[PDB]
Amino acid sequence: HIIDTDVHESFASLKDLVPYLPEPYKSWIGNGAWRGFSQPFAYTSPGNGNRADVKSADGSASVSDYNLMRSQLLDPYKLSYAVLTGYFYPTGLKLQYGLGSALASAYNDYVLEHWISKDKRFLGSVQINARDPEAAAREIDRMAAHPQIRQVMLPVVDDIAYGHPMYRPIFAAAERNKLMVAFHHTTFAQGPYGMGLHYMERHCLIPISLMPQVISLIANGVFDSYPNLRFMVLEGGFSWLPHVMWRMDREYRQGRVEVPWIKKLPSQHCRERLRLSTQPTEDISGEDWGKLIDLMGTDDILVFSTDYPHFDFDDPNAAIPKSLSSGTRDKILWKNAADFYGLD
Amino acid sequence: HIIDTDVHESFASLKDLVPYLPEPYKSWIGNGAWRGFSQPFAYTSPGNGNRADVKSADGSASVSDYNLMRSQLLDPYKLSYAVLTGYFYPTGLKLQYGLGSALASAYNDYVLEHWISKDKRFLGSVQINARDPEAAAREIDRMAAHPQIRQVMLPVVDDIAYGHPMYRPIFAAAERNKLMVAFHHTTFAQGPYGMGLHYMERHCLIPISLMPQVISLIANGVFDSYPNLRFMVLEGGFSWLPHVMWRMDREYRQGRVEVPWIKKLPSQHCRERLRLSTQPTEDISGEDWGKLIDLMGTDDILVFSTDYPHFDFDDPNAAIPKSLSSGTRDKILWKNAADFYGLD
Ligand SMILES: [Fe+3]
Ligand SMILES: [Fe+3]
Ligand SMILES: [Fe+3]
Ligand SMILES: [Mg+2]
Ligand SMILES: [Mg+2]
Numbered sequence: 001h002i003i004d005t006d007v008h009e010s011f012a013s014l015k016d017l018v019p020y021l022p023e024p025y026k027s028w029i030g031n032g033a034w035r036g037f038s039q040p041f042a043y044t045s046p047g048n049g050n051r052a053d054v055k056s057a058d059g060s061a062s063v064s065d066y067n068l069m070r071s072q073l074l075d076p077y078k079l080s081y082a083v084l085t086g087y088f089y090p091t092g093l094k095l096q097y098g099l100g101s102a103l104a105s106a107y108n109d110y111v112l113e114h115w116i117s118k119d120k121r122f123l124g125s126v127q128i129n130a131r132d133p134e135a136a137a138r139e140i141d142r143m144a145a146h147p148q149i150r151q152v153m154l155p156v157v158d159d160i161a162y163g164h165p166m167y168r169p170i171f172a173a174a175e176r177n178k179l180m181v182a183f184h185h186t187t188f189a190q191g192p193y194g195m196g197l198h199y200m201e202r203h204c205l206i207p208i209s210l211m212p213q214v215i216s217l218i219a220n221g222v223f224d225s226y227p228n229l230r231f232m233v234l235e236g237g238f239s240w241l242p243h244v245m246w247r248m249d250r251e252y253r254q255g256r257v258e259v260p261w262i263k264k265l266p267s268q269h270c271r272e273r274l275r276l277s278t279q280p281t282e283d284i285s286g287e288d289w290g291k292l293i294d295l296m297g298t299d300d301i302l303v304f305s306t307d308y309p310h311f312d313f314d315d316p317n318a319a320i321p322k323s324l325s326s327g328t329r330d331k332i333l334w335k336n337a338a339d340f341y342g343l344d
Numbered sequence: 345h346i347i348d349t350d351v352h353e354s355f356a357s358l359k360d361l362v363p364y365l366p367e368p369y370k371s372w373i374g375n376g377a378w379r380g381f382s383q384p385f386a387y388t389s390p391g392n393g394n395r396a397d398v399k400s401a402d403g404s405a406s407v408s409d410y411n412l413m414r415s416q417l418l419d420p421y422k423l424s425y426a427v428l429t430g431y432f433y434p435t436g437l438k439l440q441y442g443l444g445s446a447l448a449s450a451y452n453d454y455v456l457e458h459w460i461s462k463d464k465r466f467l468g469s470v471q472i473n474a475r476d477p478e479a480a481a482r483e484i485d486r487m488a489a490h491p492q493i494r495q496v497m498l499p500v501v502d503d504i505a506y507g508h509p510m511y512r513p514i515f516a517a518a519e520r521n522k523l524m525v526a527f528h529h530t531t532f533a534q535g536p537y538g539m540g541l542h543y544m545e546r547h548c549l550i551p552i553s554l555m556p557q558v559i560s561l562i563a564n565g566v567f568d569s570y571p572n573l574r575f576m577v578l579e580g581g582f583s584w585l586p587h588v589m590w591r592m593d594r595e596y597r598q599g600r601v602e603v604p605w606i607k608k609l610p611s612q613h614c615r616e617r618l619r620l621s622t623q624p625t626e627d628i629s630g631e632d633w634g635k636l637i638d639l640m641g642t643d644d645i646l647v648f649s650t651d652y653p654h655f656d657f658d659d660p661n662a663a664i665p666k667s668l669s670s671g672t673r674d675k676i677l678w679k680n681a682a683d684f685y686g687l688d
Contacts (some may be wrong), residue, residue, distance in 0.1 A: 044602045161537035191556040192536050193505035200599035201563035204592055212535040219545035239587035246626035255544035258388045282590035291635045
């Protein structure tokens with residue numbers, strides 16, 4: 001039993017969405033008025049962000065061929081489930097919201113037709129344009145129909161803290177439709193002072209772009225006001241979570257006159273309803289895993305992911321220390337995710 | 345012994361700096377053309393950011409009376425040394441660099457005459473305007489000649505990552521003058537998406553404004569370029585340091601080719617020359633302290649501080665768990681700081 005919570009599929013070409021777009025957007029994209037995203041840095045690994053044996057058609061760090069994924073990932077590792085978390089994140093567009101929203105819908109149509117419908121091991125994400133939270137809510141209502149769709153994907157761009165009350169229609173729609181919430185960094189993710197000055201630094205900063213989302217959701221009452229949502233943060237690490245939990249607890253105890261809508265200790269909200277992917281490895285010893293899980297106070301929090309097809313892919317047979325107890329190992333590799341997605 | 349690495353003294357009024365200012369800044373400040381900083385949020389603790397029993401003359405979260413510090417902190421605890429870290433950080437001025445630098449200089453004159461020269465337990469910090477690194481370097485040259493001056497303060501404002509090469513004259517001047525480097529957050533410290541929406545969330549975010557300075561300094565070669573410098577990050581916590589060290593090590597291994605100037609593993613750099621204060625408390629058990637020290641791989645890193653006179657003052661007799669070994673406790677309470685400042 002293995003569930004993979006982070007897999008990056010994509011179209012082969014941006015014009016694959018033209019059949020799904022209404023005019024004028026259809027003509028804008030068909031005639032080349034916008035050519036898509038191009039990450040604002042050079043990858044320093046061979047393979048251009050992917051493993052060396054995976055290329056997408058448009059060059060991005062993704063996979064555009066289901067046959068390649070099935071033959072490299074799904075079948076060889078005998079995955080029970082693989083969560084498609086996308087890669088084309090229209091929330092990265094900072095103007096022309098009507099365009100970003102039409103791209104979000106068109107992308108979800110494309111993935112349902114050429115991915116999710118091809119394999120029962122897939123669990124799908126609703127991609128959205130979070131800059132129009134009401135349109136995003138309507139796309140969530142649209143796509144929650146399909147029983148394999150299980151979460152909404154909230155992309156971490158440069159300028160959005162998702163606990164801002166502007167975004168509440170998104171979480172209300174997610175809850176309404178029995179979908180969970182997932183967070184993933186974009187090519188625009190940054191620290192307080194930018195992405196740094198080199199690729200290696202930009203990549204060190206990815207955890208720093210994501211810890212404020214946990215802090216934001218809790219301080220602004222997102223956990224308290226949608227009790228049926230669980231929240232999964234992918235690819236930001238987990239070794240920092242003891243500190244984020246203890247810190248939030250201290251600030252809650254000292255400052256609760258200011259935040260009376262928080263009705264549990266932040267650490268308790270997190271143990272109950274926050275999940276963090278294990279990928280990428282920090283190359284940590286087995287006894288160090290056990291210590292960190294102790295400090296977290298539970299083994300319910302970690303979910304396995306490979307992050308196929310990216311360069312720092314986590315081999316399922318080597319990422320999770322086998323010295324861990326069997327109950328904990330089963331939780332990390334599949335039970336924690338299974339409970340998150342309401343499976344079995 | 346006990347050495348306090350974080351104590352916030354200030355002037356009683358900004359006009360106290362007039363006697364040290366040249367024209368036209370002398371007249372600007374004396375006549376009230378600028379009235380100083382005023383933090384952009386309401387404190388939610390009784391005490392306006394301070395202990396309920398300490399009030400500064402200008403209303404800021406600091407202490408302006410040496411007699412009060414001596415009888416509330418220096419004498420009652422038998423402090424061997426106290427590091428005056430300031431509070432008024434002119435780097436927060438984002439224009440009129442000439443004025444900002446004259447204020448740094450004036451402030452340093454004030455502190456030497458009315459604070460440092462009054463008590464041999466004080467270690468002093470050079471306050472600067474980091475927006476003009478060449479002027480900042482001349483002020484470091486000017487003040488380093490006093491023996492109690494032992495470090496330069498690098499304030500963490502909203503928009504400065506100190507690893508950017510523009511800042512190298514500051515590190516060059518520190519190393520040349522045999523001073524160390526300390527970082528402290530300002531009232532302008534923030535995360536990637538601002539300082540949040542509540543005071544409690546702004547306070548949660550402080551460690552997020554400080555972790556990127558460790559990442560910036562290492563990735564951009566500050567550690568390797570200035571091997572005789574030691575770096576202290578204050579008030580950011582320390583439970584996050586294992587993640588930051590592990591992450592940076594991982595990024596280094598997979599991306600050396602981009603950063604050949606980094607001659608040691610980031611974790612080794614940190615174990616040897618990065619220090620972190622223990623304040624404020626996260627309320628964690630002695631057992632858990634020992635596990636975190638395990639995860640950093642040394643007990644050389646932590647330095648005690650009270651952060652007098654702030655609301656989350658750490659009492660020297662209760663902040664450091666007693667189940668830790670006496671060696672570790674001695675290192676934390678004074679020996680790590682003594683070696684950092686070149687004392688005893
Ligand atoms: Fe991923
Ligand atoms: Fe990735
Ligand atoms: Fe403080
Ligand atoms: Mg000196
Ligand atoms: Mg305290």
